[PDB]
Amino acid sequence: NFMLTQPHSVSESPGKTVTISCTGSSGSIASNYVQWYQQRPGSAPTTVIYEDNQRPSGVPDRFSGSIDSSSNSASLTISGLKTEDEADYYCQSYDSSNVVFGGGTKLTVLGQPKAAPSVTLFPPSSEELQANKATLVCLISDFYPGAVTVAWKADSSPVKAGVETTTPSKQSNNKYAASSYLSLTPEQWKSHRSYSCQVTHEGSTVEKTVAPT
Amino acid sequence: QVQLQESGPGLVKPSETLSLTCTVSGGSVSSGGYFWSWIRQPPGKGLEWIGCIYYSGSTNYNPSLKSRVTISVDTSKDQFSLKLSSVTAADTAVYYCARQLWLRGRFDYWGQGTLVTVSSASTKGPSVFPLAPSSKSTSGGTAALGCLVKDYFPEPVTVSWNSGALTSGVHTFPAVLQSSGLYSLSSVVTVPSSSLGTQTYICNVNHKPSNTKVDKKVEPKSCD
Amino acid sequence: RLFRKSNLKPFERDISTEIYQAGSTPCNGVEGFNCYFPLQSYGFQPTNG
Amino acid sequence: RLFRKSNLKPFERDISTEIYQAGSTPCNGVEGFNCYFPLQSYGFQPTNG
């Protein structure tokens, strides 16, 4: 029942010094070796320090670890923060034939230009109609800030059932992109004269419409 | 030096058997007195230790994962494999086979993490539908066209335009959960309106988990 | 506030935006090296822990 | 230059146009309270003494 207590979020400005704790509940930290791991998002972890006071060959001198067995908290002193240091930190122990890791500490620093929400619409295809399905796709792209609200409209009638939208996502040109889908039956597609998707962004509204043709 | 490579499928159904094999190139499993271990990491969560093994029959397991982990070492093929039983939906984690020497020490070399998201026993092929551009689908001198990837399971799907020839203006959107279980997304490209009736645009939607490759041509809408 | 010349009496408010000498520089009692006003801005964020 | 954060080594140049902080509070590097622009114009005049 030995676990390593690690702070969830630690955030400081670059260039200063920080302290990351690793606290053991039952077993003392001086009983077993503690290994710290620094892992990029979407990448394999890499050992940043081991044996509690000495460094691996490859990392800078700033990654220093200390052991305070009185409070049962293992400390990792990191000084002079940079851009590449913004990553997950995990501490390891061994207990007794059962390797136990830490909770995890990541650093987050806390930038896009404004843009115009170009919106395009498509009607359901004939191949989809032959499959007894219909879907109206609403697309929001090249916009900033990434906070848009979607509202489908039937024949002058709001639509909420079957509405699926996507959270705004960063593009390659530093803008946001978004989507909205309206699952619909083939007979309801031809029941109304027109279907329109309205996009509200920063007060302004961009509206397009489609019709069964 | 030495490197570690994982294999095996990226999927497993609920209440089934997982089979992930990690291979060794550039070194020997039996030589050096070297141990072997597996580590998983859920997305957004901390690392979790599964178990460790020796080149002999010595092994040890996490008591949370006890009586469920079966790991074996075959020296002839110079690799080691882990078998997991009674897998659930909470076992969705990025699995790392871990080259490590000191049992109380460190995982000095890490293999690349294979994504194994446990499916919801609903794996199925995608339904690709064309998105026909029209006069109301363009705003100015540029037009938009794409393909709709709807009703597929599980993640992910790779969509490419003209076998990767068209990359500029191509936007890939994250998927969203539908009203009933399944996923849906789309991939679109912005092109000038002059090249609508003179250029052919074909989207290539690939679904490796369902082993389905669908090529759908995109044409302007024909009014009927 | 981060800095002070010495201790302060309890139940006393200090609004001094006057130079604090970390070492010893007069710097016209306005600003310069080794002389800063003690006031400091925070680092609040709704996405904190 | 009238204001500087720290003492400077001999034989160098200071060109940094960042708003010097008269107080420890950051101002996002803008001419606000407790933070003033370290560069100033001269007062040269042909009719001086």
Coordinates of C-alpha atoms in Angstrom, one line a residue:
Chain A
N1 CA 0.0 0.0 0.0
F2 CA 3.0 2.3 -0.7
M3 CA 2.3 5.1 -3.1
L4 CA 4.1 8.2 -4.3
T5 CA 2.3 11.6 -3.8
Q6 CA 3.1 14.1 -6.6
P7 CA 1.5 17.5 -7.2
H8 CA -0.8 17.6 -10.2
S9 CA 0.0 21.1 -11.6
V10 CA 3.1 23.2 -11.1
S11 CA 3.6 26.4 -13.2
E12 CA 6.3 29.1 -13.0
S13 CA 7.8 31.6 -15.3
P14 CA 10.9 30.6 -17.3
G15 CA 14.3 31.4 -15.9
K16 CA 13.5 30.8 -12.2
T17 CA 13.9 27.7 -10.0
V18 CA 11.2 25.2 -9.0
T19 CA 10.8 22.3 -6.6
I20 CA 8.8 19.2 -7.4
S21 CA 7.9 16.9 -4.5
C22 CA 7.4 13.1 -4.4
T23 CA 5.9 12.0 -1.1
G24 CA 5.7 8.4 0.1
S25 CA 2.8 7.3 2.3
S26 CA 3.9 4.2 4.2
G27 CA 7.5 3.4 3.1
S28 CA 10.3 5.8 3.6
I29 CA 11.9 7.4 0.6
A30 CA 15.4 6.6 1.9
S31 CA 14.5 2.9 1.8
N32 CA 14.5 2.6 -2.0
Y33 CA 15.9 4.4 -5.0
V34 CA 13.7 7.1 -6.7
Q35 CA 13.8 7.6 -10.5
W36 CA 12.3 10.7 -12.2
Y37 CA 11.0 10.5 -15.8
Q38 CA 10.5 13.4 -18.2
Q39 CA 8.1 12.5 -21.0
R40 CA 7.0 14.5 -24.0
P41 CA 3.3 14.4 -25.0
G42 CA 2.9 11.7 -27.5
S43 CA 6.4 10.3 -27.0
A44 CA 8.3 7.7 -25.0
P45 CA 9.4 8.7 -21.5
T46 CA 13.0 9.5 -20.8
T47 CA 14.9 9.2 -17.5
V48 CA 15.9 12.7 -16.4
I49 CA 17.7 11.8 -13.2
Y50 CA 18.5 8.6 -11.2
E51 CA 20.1 7.5 -8.0
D52 CA 18.7 10.6 -6.3
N53 CA 21.7 12.9 -6.5
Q54 CA 23.5 12.2 -9.8
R55 CA 22.7 12.9 -13.5
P56 CA 22.6 10.8 -16.7
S57 CA 24.9 11.9 -19.5
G58 CA 22.9 14.1 -21.9
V59 CA 20.7 16.3 -19.7
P60 CA 21.9 19.7 -18.4
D61 CA 23.2 20.4 -14.9
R62 CA 19.9 22.1 -13.9
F63 CA 18.1 18.8 -13.1
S64 CA 19.1 18.2 -9.5
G65 CA 17.4 15.9 -7.0
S66 CA 17.4 15.8 -3.2
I67 CA 16.2 13.4 -0.6
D68 CA 14.5 14.6 2.7
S69 CA 13.8 11.4 4.6
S70 CA 12.5 13.3 7.6
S71 CA 9.3 14.4 5.8
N72 CA 9.3 11.3 3.5
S73 CA 9.1 13.7 0.5
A74 CA 11.5 13.3 -2.5
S75 CA 12.4 16.7 -4.1
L76 CA 13.6 17.4 -7.6
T77 CA 15.1 20.9 -8.0
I78 CA 14.9 22.4 -11.5
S79 CA 16.4 25.8 -12.3
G80 CA 16.3 28.0 -15.3
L81 CA 13.1 27.0 -17.0
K82 CA 13.1 26.8 -20.8
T83 CA 10.6 25.9 -23.6
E84 CA 11.6 22.2 -23.9
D85 CA 11.1 21.6 -20.2
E86 CA 7.3 21.8 -20.4
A87 CA 6.6 18.1 -20.0
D88 CA 5.3 15.4 -17.6
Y89 CA 7.3 14.4 -14.5
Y90 CA 6.9 11.1 -12.8
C91 CA 8.8 9.6 -9.8
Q92 CA 9.4 5.9 -9.4
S93 CA 10.0 3.6 -6.4
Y94 CA 10.2 -0.1 -5.8
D95 CA 8.5 -0.9 -2.5
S96 CA 9.0 -4.7 -2.3
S97 CA 9.0 -6.5 -5.6
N98 CA 6.3 -4.1 -6.9
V99 CA 7.4 -1.0 -8.9
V100 CA 5.2 2.0 -7.9
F101 CA 5.2 5.2 -10.0
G102 CA 4.1 8.8 -9.1
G103 CA 1.0 10.8 -9.8
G104 CA 2.5 13.1 -12.4
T105 CA 3.5 16.8 -12.6
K106 CA 3.3 18.8 -15.9
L107 CA 4.2 22.4 -16.6
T108 CA 2.0 24.6 -18.7
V109 CA 3.0 28.1 -19.8
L110 CA 0.1 30.6 -19.3
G111 CA -1.3 33.0 -29.3
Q112 CA -3.3 33.2 -32.5
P113 CA -4.4 36.1 -34.8
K114 CA -8.1 37.0 -35.3
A115 CA -9.9 35.7 -38.4
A116 CA -13.2 35.6 -40.3
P117 CA -15.5 32.5 -39.9
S118 CA -15.8 31.1 -43.5
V119 CA -18.8 28.7 -43.5
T120 CA -19.7 26.2 -46.2
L121 CA -22.7 23.8 -46.5
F122 CA -23.4 20.6 -48.4
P123 CA -26.7 18.7 -48.9
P124 CA -26.9 14.9 -48.3
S125 CA -25.6 12.9 -51.3
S126 CA -27.7 10.6 -53.4
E127 CA -25.6 7.6 -52.4
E128 CA -26.4 8.3 -48.8
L129 CA -30.1 8.6 -49.7
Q130 CA -29.9 5.2 -51.4
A131 CA -28.6 3.8 -48.0
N132 CA -31.7 5.2 -46.2
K133 CA -29.6 7.8 -44.5
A134 CA -29.1 11.6 -44.7
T135 CA -26.6 13.9 -43.0
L136 CA -26.3 17.7 -43.2
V137 CA -22.7 18.9 -42.6
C138 CA -21.9 22.4 -41.3
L139 CA -18.3 23.5 -41.4
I140 CA -16.6 26.4 -39.7
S141 CA -13.0 27.1 -40.6
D142 CA -10.3 29.8 -40.6
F143 CA -11.8 31.6 -37.5
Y144 CA -10.5 33.1 -34.3
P145 CA -11.4 33.1 -31.3
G146 CA -12.2 29.4 -31.2
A147 CA -15.7 29.9 -29.6
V148 CA -18.6 29.4 -32.1
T149 CA -22.2 28.4 -31.6
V150 CA -24.1 26.3 -34.1
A151 CA -27.9 26.2 -34.6
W152 CA -29.5 24.2 -37.4
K153 CA -32.7 25.5 -39.0
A154 CA -35.4 23.5 -40.9
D155 CA -38.2 25.3 -42.6
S156 CA -37.8 28.4 -40.4
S157 CA -37.6 25.9 -37.5
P158 CA -34.7 25.3 -35.2
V159 CA -33.3 21.7 -35.1
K160 CA -31.8 20.1 -32.1
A161 CA -32.3 16.3 -32.5
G162 CA -29.5 14.6 -34.3
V163 CA -27.2 17.6 -34.0
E164 CA -23.5 16.7 -33.5
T165 CA -20.8 19.4 -33.5
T166 CA -17.1 19.3 -33.0
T167 CA -14.9 21.4 -30.7
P168 CA -12.8 24.1 -32.4
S169 CA -9.3 22.8 -33.4
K170 CA -6.1 24.6 -34.4
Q171 CA -5.3 24.7 -38.1
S172 CA -2.0 25.0 -39.9
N173 CA -2.4 28.7 -40.6
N174 CA -2.8 29.4 -36.8
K175 CA -6.6 29.7 -37.0
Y176 CA -9.4 27.3 -35.7
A177 CA -11.5 24.8 -37.5
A178 CA -14.9 23.3 -36.5
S179 CA -17.6 21.0 -37.8
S180 CA -21.3 20.3 -37.2
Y181 CA -23.3 17.3 -38.4
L182 CA -27.1 16.9 -38.5
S183 CA -28.2 13.2 -38.8
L184 CA -31.6 13.1 -40.6
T185 CA -34.0 10.8 -42.2
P186 CA -34.5 10.9 -46.0
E187 CA -38.2 11.7 -45.8
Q188 CA -37.6 14.6 -43.4
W189 CA -35.0 16.0 -45.8
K190 CA -37.6 16.4 -48.5
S191 CA -40.4 17.4 -46.0
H192 CA -39.0 20.9 -45.5
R193 CA -38.4 23.4 -48.3
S194 CA -34.9 24.4 -47.2
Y195 CA -32.3 23.6 -44.5
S196 CA -29.9 26.2 -43.2
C197 CA -27.0 26.3 -40.8
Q198 CA -26.3 29.5 -38.8
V199 CA -22.9 30.2 -37.3
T200 CA -22.6 32.9 -34.6
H201 CA -19.0 34.3 -34.0
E202 CA -18.2 37.5 -32.1
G203 CA -21.8 38.7 -32.5
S204 CA -21.8 38.4 -36.3
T205 CA -23.8 35.7 -38.0
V206 CA -22.9 33.9 -41.2
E207 CA -25.8 31.9 -42.8
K208 CA -26.0 29.6 -45.8
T209 CA -28.8 27.5 -47.0
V210 CA -29.3 24.3 -49.0
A211 CA -32.4 22.8 -50.7
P212 CA -33.2 19.4 -52.2
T213 CA -32.4 19.8 -55.9
Chain B
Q1 CA 23.3 0.3 -29.8
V2 CA 20.1 -1.6 -29.1
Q3 CA 16.4 -0.8 -29.8
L4 CA 13.0 -2.1 -28.8
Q5 CA 10.1 -2.6 -31.2
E6 CA 6.5 -3.6 -30.2
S7 CA 4.0 -5.4 -32.4
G8 CA 0.6 -7.0 -32.2
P9 CA -2.8 -5.6 -33.0
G10 CA -3.8 -2.2 -31.6
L11 CA -7.3 -3.4 -30.7
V12 CA -8.9 -5.9 -28.3
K13 CA -12.5 -6.7 -27.7
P14 CA -14.0 -6.7 -24.1
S15 CA -13.5 -9.8 -22.1
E16 CA -10.9 -11.1 -24.5
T17 CA -7.1 -11.9 -24.6
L18 CA -4.6 -9.3 -25.4
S19 CA -1.4 -10.3 -27.3
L20 CA 1.3 -7.7 -27.5
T21 CA 4.8 -8.8 -28.5
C22 CA 7.9 -6.6 -28.0
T23 CA 11.0 -7.5 -30.1
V24 CA 14.7 -6.9 -29.5
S25 CA 17.2 -5.9 -32.2
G26 CA 20.8 -5.0 -31.6
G27 CA 21.3 -7.1 -28.5
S28 CA 20.6 -10.4 -26.8
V29 CA 17.8 -11.2 -24.4
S30 CA 19.6 -13.8 -22.3
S31 CA 23.0 -12.1 -22.3
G32 CA 24.0 -9.4 -19.8
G33 CA 21.8 -10.6 -17.0
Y34 CA 19.1 -8.2 -18.3
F35 CA 15.5 -8.0 -17.0
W36 CA 12.4 -7.1 -19.0
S37 CA 9.2 -5.3 -18.0
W38 CA 6.0 -3.8 -19.4
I39 CA 4.5 -0.4 -18.6
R40 CA 1.2 1.1 -19.6
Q41 CA 0.1 4.7 -19.5
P42 CA -3.5 5.9 -19.9
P43 CA -4.0 9.1 -21.9
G44 CA -3.9 12.0 -19.5
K45 CA -2.9 9.7 -16.5
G46 CA 0.3 8.6 -14.9
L47 CA 2.5 5.6 -15.8
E48 CA 1.3 2.3 -14.4
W49 CA 3.6 -0.7 -13.8
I50 CA 2.3 -4.0 -15.1
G51 CA 5.0 -6.5 -14.4
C52 CA 8.7 -7.5 -14.9
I53 CA 10.4 -10.7 -16.1
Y54 CA 13.8 -12.3 -16.3
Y55 CA 15.1 -14.4 -19.1
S56 CA 14.4 -17.4 -16.8
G57 CA 11.0 -18.1 -15.3
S58 CA 11.3 -15.4 -12.6
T59 CA 8.4 -12.9 -12.7
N60 CA 6.4 -10.5 -10.6
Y61 CA 3.1 -8.7 -11.1
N62 CA 1.3 -5.6 -9.8
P63 CA -1.2 -6.8 -7.1
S64 CA -3.8 -4.7 -8.8
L65 CA -3.0 -6.6 -12.0
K66 CA -2.3 -10.0 -10.2
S67 CA -3.6 -13.2 -11.7
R68 CA -4.3 -11.5 -15.0
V69 CA -0.8 -10.9 -16.5
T70 CA 0.9 -13.8 -18.4
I71 CA 4.3 -12.8 -19.8
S72 CA 6.7 -15.3 -21.5
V73 CA 10.2 -15.0 -23.0
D74 CA 11.4 -16.9 -26.0
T75 CA 15.2 -16.7 -26.6
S76 CA 15.2 -18.3 -30.0
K77 CA 13.2 -15.4 -31.6
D78 CA 14.9 -12.8 -29.2
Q79 CA 11.7 -11.2 -28.0
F80 CA 9.2 -11.3 -25.1
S81 CA 5.4 -11.1 -25.1
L82 CA 2.7 -10.3 -22.6
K83 CA -0.8 -11.8 -22.5
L84 CA -3.6 -10.0 -20.7
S85 CA -6.9 -11.7 -19.7
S86 CA -10.3 -10.3 -18.9
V87 CA -9.6 -6.9 -20.5
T88 CA -12.1 -4.1 -19.9
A89 CA -12.9 -0.6 -21.2
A90 CA -10.8 0.9 -18.4
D91 CA -7.6 -0.8 -19.7
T92 CA -7.2 1.8 -22.6
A93 CA -3.6 2.8 -22.2
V94 CA -0.4 3.3 -24.2
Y95 CA 1.7 0.2 -23.7
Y96 CA 5.4 0.5 -23.4
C97 CA 7.7 -2.5 -23.4
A98 CA 10.5 -1.4 -21.1
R99 CA 14.2 -2.3 -21.4
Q100 CA 15.5 -2.0 -17.8
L101 CA 18.6 -3.4 -16.1
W102 CA 18.3 -2.6 -12.4
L103 CA 15.1 -3.9 -10.8
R104 CA 15.1 -1.0 -8.3
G105 CA 16.5 1.4 -10.9
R106 CA 15.3 2.8 -14.2
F107 CA 13.9 2.1 -17.6
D108 CA 17.0 3.4 -19.5
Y109 CA 15.7 2.7 -23.0
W110 CA 12.0 3.0 -23.8
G111 CA 10.3 1.5 -26.8
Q112 CA 7.7 3.5 -28.8
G113 CA 4.3 3.3 -27.3
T114 CA 1.6 1.4 -29.2
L115 CA -1.9 2.8 -28.8
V116 CA -4.2 0.0 -27.7
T117 CA -7.7 1.4 -27.0
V118 CA -10.0 -1.4 -25.9
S119 CA -13.0 -1.5 -28.3
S120 CA -16.7 -1.5 -27.1
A121 CA -17.4 -4.8 -29.0
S122 CA -18.8 -2.7 -31.9
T123 CA -16.0 -2.6 -34.5
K124 CA -17.5 -1.9 -37.9
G125 CA -16.7 -0.4 -41.3
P126 CA -17.1 3.2 -42.2
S127 CA -19.8 4.8 -44.5
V128 CA -18.2 7.3 -46.8
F129 CA -20.5 9.8 -48.5
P130 CA -19.5 12.5 -51.0
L131 CA -20.0 16.2 -50.3
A132 CA -21.0 17.7 -53.6
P133 CA -20.1 21.4 -54.0
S134 CA -22.6 23.8 -55.5
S135 CA -23.2 27.5 -56.0
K136 CA -24.3 27.9 -52.4
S137 CA -21.2 26.0 -51.1
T138 CA -18.7 28.7 -52.3
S139 CA -18.1 32.2 -50.9
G140 CA -16.1 34.3 -53.4
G141 CA -13.4 33.0 -55.7
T142 CA -12.8 29.7 -53.8
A143 CA -15.0 26.6 -53.3
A144 CA -15.1 23.8 -50.7
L145 CA -15.6 20.1 -51.2
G146 CA -15.0 17.0 -49.1
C147 CA -16.1 13.6 -47.9
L148 CA -18.2 12.5 -44.9
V149 CA -16.9 9.7 -42.7
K150 CA -19.9 8.5 -40.7
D151 CA -20.9 5.5 -38.6
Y152 CA -17.5 3.8 -38.0
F153 CA -15.8 2.1 -35.0
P154 CA -13.2 2.4 -33.5
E155 CA -10.8 5.3 -33.8
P156 CA -8.9 6.4 -35.8
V157 CA -9.4 6.9 -39.6
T158 CA -6.9 8.3 -42.0
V159 CA -8.2 10.4 -44.9
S160 CA -6.0 11.4 -47.8
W161 CA -6.7 13.4 -50.9
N162 CA -5.5 12.2 -54.3
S163 CA -3.2 9.6 -52.5
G164 CA -1.6 12.5 -50.6
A165 CA -1.0 14.8 -53.6
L166 CA -3.3 17.5 -52.2
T167 CA -2.2 18.7 -48.7
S168 CA -2.7 22.5 -48.9
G169 CA -6.2 23.5 -47.7
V170 CA -6.9 20.0 -46.3
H171 CA -8.5 20.1 -42.9
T172 CA -8.9 16.9 -40.8
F173 CA -11.4 17.3 -38.0
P174 CA -11.5 15.3 -34.7
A175 CA -14.3 12.8 -34.3
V176 CA -17.3 13.2 -32.0
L177 CA -19.5 10.6 -30.3
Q178 CA -22.9 10.3 -32.1
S179 CA -26.2 9.9 -30.4
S180 CA -25.8 6.1 -30.3
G181 CA -22.2 4.9 -29.8
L182 CA -20.7 5.4 -33.2
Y183 CA -18.3 8.1 -34.5
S184 CA -18.4 10.6 -37.3
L185 CA -16.1 13.2 -38.9
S186 CA -15.2 14.7 -42.3
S187 CA -12.2 15.9 -44.3
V188 CA -12.4 18.8 -46.7
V189 CA -10.2 20.8 -49.1
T190 CA -10.6 24.3 -50.3
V191 CA -10.1 24.8 -54.1
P192 CA -10.7 27.6 -56.6
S193 CA -14.1 27.4 -58.3
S194 CA -12.5 27.3 -61.8
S195 CA -11.1 23.8 -61.2
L196 CA -14.5 22.3 -60.2
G197 CA -15.5 20.8 -63.5
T198 CA -12.0 20.3 -64.8
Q199 CA -10.2 18.6 -61.9
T200 CA -11.1 15.3 -60.3
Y201 CA -10.9 15.1 -56.5
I202 CA -10.9 11.6 -54.9
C203 CA -10.7 11.1 -51.1
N204 CA -9.1 8.0 -49.7
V205 CA -10.6 7.0 -46.3
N206 CA -8.7 4.1 -44.7
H207 CA -10.0 2.2 -41.7
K208 CA -7.3 -0.2 -40.6
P209 CA -9.2 -1.8 -37.6
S210 CA -12.1 -2.8 -39.9
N211 CA -9.7 -3.5 -42.9
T212 CA -11.7 -1.2 -45.2
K213 CA -10.3 1.2 -47.8
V214 CA -12.9 3.3 -49.6
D215 CA -12.1 5.7 -52.5
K216 CA -14.9 8.1 -53.2
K217 CA -14.9 10.6 -56.0
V218 CA -16.2 14.2 -55.3
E219 CA -18.1 15.8 -58.1
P220 CA -20.3 19.0 -58.3
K221 CA -24.0 18.4 -57.5
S222 CA -26.2 17.3 -60.4
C223 CA -29.7 18.7 -60.0
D224 CA -32.5 16.2 -60.6
Chain C
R1 CA 4.1 42.7 -1.6
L2 CA 7.4 40.9 -1.8
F3 CA 9.9 43.2 -0.1
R4 CA 10.2 45.4 3.0
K5 CA 13.0 47.3 4.7
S6 CA 12.1 45.9 8.2
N7 CA 9.3 44.4 10.2
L8 CA 5.9 46.1 10.5
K9 CA 3.5 46.5 13.4
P10 CA 0.4 44.3 13.5
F11 CA -2.9 45.8 12.3
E12 CA -1.0 48.3 10.1
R13 CA -1.4 48.8 6.4
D14 CA 1.5 49.7 4.1
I15 CA 0.7 51.3 0.7
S16 CA 4.2 52.6 0.1
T17 CA 5.3 52.4 -3.6
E18 CA 8.6 53.8 -2.5
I19 CA 12.1 52.4 -3.3
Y20 CA 13.2 49.3 -1.5
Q21 CA 17.0 48.8 -1.3
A22 CA 17.9 45.1 -1.6
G23 CA 21.5 46.3 -1.2
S24 CA 22.5 49.9 -1.1
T25 CA 21.7 52.2 -4.1
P26 CA 20.0 55.6 -3.7
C27 CA 19.1 55.8 -7.4
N28 CA 17.3 59.2 -6.8
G29 CA 14.8 57.2 -4.7
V30 CA 12.7 56.5 -7.9
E31 CA 14.2 53.5 -9.7
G32 CA 17.4 51.9 -10.9
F33 CA 19.7 49.0 -10.1
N34 CA 19.2 47.3 -6.7
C35 CA 16.2 49.5 -6.0
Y36 CA 12.6 48.4 -6.8
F37 CA 9.2 49.1 -5.4
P38 CA 7.9 46.1 -3.4
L39 CA 4.6 45.6 -5.1
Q40 CA 4.2 42.4 -7.2
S41 CA 1.5 41.1 -9.6
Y42 CA -0.1 37.7 -9.1
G43 CA -0.4 34.7 -11.4
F44 CA -4.0 33.7 -11.1
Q45 CA -5.7 31.5 -13.7
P46 CA -9.1 29.7 -13.8
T47 CA -7.3 26.5 -15.0
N48 CA -5.1 26.2 -11.9
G49 CA -5.0 23.3 -9.4
Chain D
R1 CA 19.5 55.2 -20.8
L2 CA 18.5 56.3 -17.3
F3 CA 17.2 53.0 -15.8
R4 CA 18.7 49.5 -15.6
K5 CA 17.8 46.3 -13.9
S6 CA 21.3 45.2 -12.8
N7 CA 24.9 46.3 -12.8
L8 CA 26.6 45.8 -16.1
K9 CA 30.0 44.3 -17.1
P10 CA 32.6 46.7 -18.6
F11 CA 33.0 46.8 -22.4
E12 CA 29.5 46.0 -23.6
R13 CA 26.3 47.6 -25.0
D14 CA 22.8 47.9 -23.7
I15 CA 20.1 48.1 -26.5
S16 CA 17.2 46.3 -24.8
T17 CA 14.0 48.4 -25.2
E18 CA 11.9 46.4 -22.6
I19 CA 10.1 48.5 -20.1
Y20 CA 12.3 48.6 -17.0
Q21 CA 10.3 47.8 -13.9
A22 CA 10.5 50.5 -11.3
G23 CA 8.5 48.1 -9.1
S24 CA 8.7 44.4 -8.8
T25 CA 5.2 44.1 -10.3
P26 CA 5.2 43.2 -14.0
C27 CA 3.2 45.4 -16.3
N28 CA 3.4 43.1 -19.4
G29 CA 6.3 45.4 -20.3
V30 CA 4.2 48.5 -20.7
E31 CA 4.5 52.1 -19.4
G32 CA 2.3 51.6 -16.3
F33 CA 2.6 52.2 -12.6
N34 CA 5.8 51.0 -11.0
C35 CA 7.3 50.4 -14.4
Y36 CA 8.8 53.1 -16.7
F37 CA 10.6 53.2 -20.1
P38 CA 14.4 53.2 -19.5
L39 CA 15.3 55.3 -22.6
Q40 CA 14.9 59.1 -22.6
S41 CA 15.6 61.8 -25.1
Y42 CA 18.2 64.5 -24.5
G43 CA 17.8 68.2 -24.1
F44 CA 20.3 69.6 -26.5
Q45 CA 20.0 73.2 -27.7
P46 CA 22.4 75.4 -29.7
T47 CA 21.7 78.3 -27.3
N48 CA 22.8 76.4 -24.2
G49 CA 25.7 77.3 -21.8

